[PDB]
C-alpha cells in the first residue's frame, strides 16, 4: 500500500561465487562416473550481487534493506546466511500485479506455503512480524506482500526447512542455497542447507544442491523479487524501509547461462567435485580428457575461428558518366510511346549513384527489395527508359498488370521486378530531362506483351475532351501527354527505367542498381563480387589479370583472387584465420599453469579470434599478455621463450618444445 518504496537506496555490492551453485542435472544415479552435461549452471568464480540488509547500533553506521525487482532470464540462483531466518520467500512473475498469474513462495513457522494467484504485489513486499504482547516471541501481524488475488490456480504445502527464530551466536552458520529455473514449463527448485563458520562472504567448500520439488505451473516468468520480514519501526531502530525496519541479514543472488560442466559422481551417487569447462584452459582440457587430472603434455581442446566482421558487396563502376547510362538521361530517348531498348553487359547507368549512401525510394521495387538484386537477378529483362511525371509510372510499374493499365505499354502479368525513377542535383550525374512528349491513354485492340503500342488507333468517343496537360477527365485516346483522372498525377518530371520482363532464354541479363560497399583490406570480411561469394581477408594482389578476366582460381579450383569491378585492381582472397587450440600444461599435480597454442595464426589476431567474451580474469590472461611468443607451428601464449635449448619435454612443432621450470 505504498506508491513508491522509500529507503537509502545505496549502490549494491559484489562478491565471488566460487564453486557454489552446483546441482544434480538429473535424477539418474551414477557411481564413480565423470558425467559431462550441458545445462543452465552458475559459472565458477563468477560475480554475484551482495544485497545488504543490516542495522548498526551506534551513532552512525550503514543501515539498509534492499528488495527490488530483478530480471528472471533463463535462471536464477539465490543464497542467504542469517543468524535468524529473515528471507521468508520469493516472488516470481512478469507484470507483478493482477494482470498475470504469478508464483508466490512464502515461509512461516508451521509449513512452507506455495500458491499461484494473480497477486497484486506491493512495491515493497514483506512480512509484518512483531513481538508478542505477553509471550515475548515473534508474532506475525500483516502479510504485506499483496493486496488482492481475484483468482486461484494452485496451492501446495511442504514441511518447513531449518528453523532459526531468535537470533543467537555471532556466526551465520544457517546457510541456505536455492536454484530456480522455468525451462520446459517446469518450475524446478534445487536447494540445500549446510552449516558454515564464517561471518562474511561465502564458504570455500563444495556441496551439490539436491533437488527438492518440481512444480509444473507452466506460467511464463520474466521478473522476480525477494521478500523478508520487517519489524515495527516505533518498537525497534533501523532504516525506515517505507516506515518499517528489520534485523541483521545478508543474502546473495546470481544468474545462470547455458554451458557445459564435468560432474564427478561419488560411489554413493553424490556429487563431490565439478569442473566448469568454460572457466579456464585447464578446465577445458580436463573436460576434453573427461578427467579431473591431466598428465603432462599438449592436448588439442577446441578450434578457434575468426568470424567475419562485416559484409562487403561490390559491383562494376557506379557508373558515373558511362555511355550506356547517358542514353537514359538525356540522349536518344523518348516517352513511353517511344522508349529506348538496350541490353549489354558493359556497365550500369547513373541511377546507382544514389545506391551508395543516399538510397531514396527512387529505386522503386515491387515484391522484392533492391538488396536481393545483388544476391541474385531476374530472368531476361530489357532496358526500357523514358521520361514521365514522377510517380506516373504506376500505370507501367509492376503490380498494375493484367489488362488494367497495359494498354499504353503491356507487361507480363507476373511482372515482379524493379523500376528506377531517380533525380538529384548532387547525388547524380545529369538532371532529369523534359517530359513534353506524346502519350496514349486507351486503345481497343490488344497489345503484344512486354511491348509498347505502335498502332495508330483513334476512338471517336466523348464530347468535351480535356485541355492541356492538366485538366478534368479525358476521353480522347491520343493527346499531348496523358494522365488518369482516377489516380494521382502531375508529379515532378522524372526519367524512369523499367525492367521489361521477358522470361525467355538468356537469364541473368542486365539488372537494376547494384550496391558498391567500401573496400576493406587486411581485415576479414564477407565479400560478394558479381555473384561470386565467399569469406576471407581481402588484400592487394600483384597478379596481373587480363582485361577480360574478372577473378582467378588456384589449382584446386577455388577462388584466390578477384579483380575489383570498379577500380579494376586485383585483390587476393585469403581464408579466415582458423586453426586448432592446443593447451600446454604439465601434470595437474605439479601445477595448474597452462599455455595456449593457436595453430597457424598471427599473434595479433589471437584476441579477436572469438575471444574476449568469456571469463576475462581466467581466459584473457592466456589469450594475450607480454609473454606472447610466435613460432612456426603457431602463436604461443602463457610461456616465456628462452635460448637455453634444453631437451624437448612437450612436443610443440618445428623443433620447439615446452617444459615446466621453477
Amino acid at each position, epitope marked *: 500500500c505504498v506508491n513508491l518504496t522509500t529507503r537509502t537506496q545505496l549502490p549494491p555490492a559484489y562478491t565471488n561465487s566460487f564453486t557454489r551453485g552446483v546441482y544434480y542435472p538429473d535424477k539418474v544415479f551414477r557411481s564413480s562416473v565423470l558425467h559431462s552435461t550441458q545445462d543452465l549452471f552458475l559459472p565458477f568464480f563468477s560475480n554475484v550481487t551482495w544485497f545488504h540488509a543490516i542495522h548498526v547500533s551506534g551513532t552512525n553506521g550503514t543501515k539498509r534493506f534492499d528488495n527490488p525487482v530483478l530480471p528472471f532470464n533463463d535462471g536464477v540462483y539465490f543464497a542467504s546466511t542469517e543468524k535468524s531466518n529473515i528471507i521468508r520467500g520469493w516472488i516470481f512473475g512478469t507484470t507483478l500485479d493482477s494482470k498475470t498469474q504469478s508464483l508466490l513462495i512464502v515461509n512461516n513457522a508451521t509449513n512452507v506455503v506455495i500458491k499461484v494467484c494473480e497477486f497484486q504485489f506491493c512495491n515493497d513486499p514483506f512480512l509484518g512480524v512483531y513481538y508478542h504482547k505477553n509471550n515475548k516471541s515473534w508474532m506475525e501481524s500483516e502479510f504485506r506482500v499483496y493486496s488482492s488475488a481475484n483468482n486461484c490456480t494452485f496451492e501446495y504445502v511442504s514441511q518447513p526447512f531449518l528453523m532459526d527464530l531468535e537470533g543467537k551466536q555471532g556466526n551465520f552458520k544457517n546457510l541456505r542455497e536455492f536454484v530456480f529455473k522455468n525451462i520446459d514449463g517446469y518450475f524446478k527448485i534445487y536447494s540445500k542447507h549446510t552449516p558454515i563458520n564464517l561471518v562474511r562472504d561465502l564458504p570455500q567448500g563444495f556441496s551439490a544442491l539436491e533437488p527438492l520439488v518440481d512444480l509444473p505451473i507452466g506460467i511464463n516468468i520474466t521478473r522476480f523479487q525477494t521478500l523478508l520480514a520487517l519489524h515495527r519501526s516505533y518498537l525497534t531502530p533501523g532504516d525506515s524501509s517505507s516506515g518499517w525496519t528489520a534485523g541483521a541479514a545478508a543474502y546473495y543472488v546470481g544468474y545462470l547461462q547455458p554451458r557445459t560442466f564435468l560432474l564427478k559422481y561419488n560411489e554413493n551417487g553424490t556429487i563431490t567435485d565439478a569442473v566448469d569447462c568454460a572457466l579456464d584452459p585447464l578446465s577445458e582440457t580436463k573436460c576434453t580428457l573427461k578427467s579431473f587430472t591431466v598428465e603432462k603434455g599438449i592436448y588439442q581442446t577446441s578450434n578457434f575461428r575468426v568470424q567475419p566482421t562485416e559484409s562487403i558487396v561490390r559491383f562494376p563502376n557506379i557508373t558515373n558518366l558511362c555511355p550506356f547510362g547517358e542514353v537514359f538521361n538525356a540522349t536518344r530517348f523518348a516517352s513511353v510511346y517511344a522508349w529506348n531498348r538496350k541490353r549489354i553487359s558493359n556497365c550500369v547507368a547513373d541511377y546507382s549513384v544514389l545506391y551508395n549512401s543516399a*538510397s531514396f*525510394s527512387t529505386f522503386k521495387c515491387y515484391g522484392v527489395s533492391p538488396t536481393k538484386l545483388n544476391d541474385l537477378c531476374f530472368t531476361n529483362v530489357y532496358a526500357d527508359s523514358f521520361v514521365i511525371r514522377g510517380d506516373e509510372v504506376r500505370q507501367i510499374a509492376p503490380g498494375q498488370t493484367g489488362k488494367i493499365a497495359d494498354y499504353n505499354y503491356k507487361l507480363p502479368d507476373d511482372f515482379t521486378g524493379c*523500376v528506377i525513377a531517380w533525380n538529384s542535383n548532387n547525388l547524380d550525374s545529369k538532371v532529369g530531362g523534359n517530359y513534353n512528349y506524346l502519350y496514349r491513354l486507351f486503345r481497343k485492340s490488344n497489345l503484344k506483351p512486354f511491348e509498347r503500342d505502335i498502332s495508330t488507333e483513334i476512338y471517336q468517343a466523348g464530347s468535351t475532351p480535356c485541355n492541356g496537360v492538366e485538366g478534368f477527365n479525358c476521353y480522347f485516346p491520343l493527346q499531348s501527354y496523358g494522365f488518369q483522372p482516377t489516380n494521382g498525377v502531375g508529379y515532378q518530371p522524372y526519367r524512369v527505367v523499367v525492367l521489361s520482363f521477358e522470361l525467355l532464354h538468356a537469364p541473368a541479363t542486365v539488372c537494376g542498381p547494384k550496391k558498391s560497399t567500401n573496400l576493406v583490406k587486411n581485415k576479414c570480411v564477407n565479400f560478394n563480387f558479381n555473384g561470386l561469394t565467399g569469406t576471407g581477408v581481402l588484400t592487394e594482389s600483384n597478379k596481373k589479370f587480363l582485361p577480360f578476366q574478372q577473378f582467378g582460381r588456384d589449382i584446386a579450383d577455388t577462388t584466390d583472387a578477384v579483380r575489383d569491378p570498379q577500380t579494376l585492381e586485383i585483390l587476393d582472397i585469403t581464408p579466415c584465420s582458423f586453426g586448432g587450440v592446443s593447451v600446454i600444461t604439465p601434470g595437474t599435480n605439479t601445477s595448474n599453469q597452462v599455455a595456449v597454442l593457436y595453430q597457424d595464426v598471427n599473434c595479433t589476431e589471437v584476441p579477436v579470434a572469438i575471444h574476449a567474451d568469456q571469463l576475462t580474469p581466467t581466459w584473457r590472461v592466456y589469450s594475450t599478455g607480454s609473454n606472447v611468443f610466435q613460432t612456426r607451428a603457431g602463436c604461443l601464449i602463457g610461456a616465456e621463450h628462452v635460448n637455453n635449448s634444453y631437451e624437448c619435454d612437450i612436443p610443440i612443432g618445428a623443433g620447439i618444445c615446452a617444459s615446466y621450470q621453477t
Partner: nanobody
Amino acid sequence: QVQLVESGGGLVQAGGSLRLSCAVSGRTISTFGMGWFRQAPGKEREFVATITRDEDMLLYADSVKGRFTISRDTAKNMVFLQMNSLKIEDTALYYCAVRRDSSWGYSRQSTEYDYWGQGTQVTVSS
C-alpha cells in the same frame, strides 16, 4: 473482412510517437512487409513509409537514418513501426484488417488499395 489484432492505431497525435502496429498473417515469421496507406477522397493524404519483405532496408529514408522495425512476436506475430512528425489533420478511414496486397516492395507510387472499404468513420477535418 475479419479485423486483425493491433496494439494501437488510428489517427495520429501531435508530439511524442505512436508505435502503429497490425497483426500479420504469418506466425513467428518476420519475413514479411507492411503498408499503412489510407485511402480516402481529397488531397488530405500523406505518404507513409513502407517495409520490404527482406527487412534489411527500412522506410523510404533507407537504413542510414531509419531505425530497426520489430516484426517478430511470441503471443501473436506483429509489426512495429515508428511514426515521424506529421500534421494532425486527417480524414481517411482506419481499418486494421487483412491487407489486400502481399507483394510488398520498395516502390513509392504503390499504395495499399485504390478504392476505400469498411472502416471507422472517424474524421477531424470536415
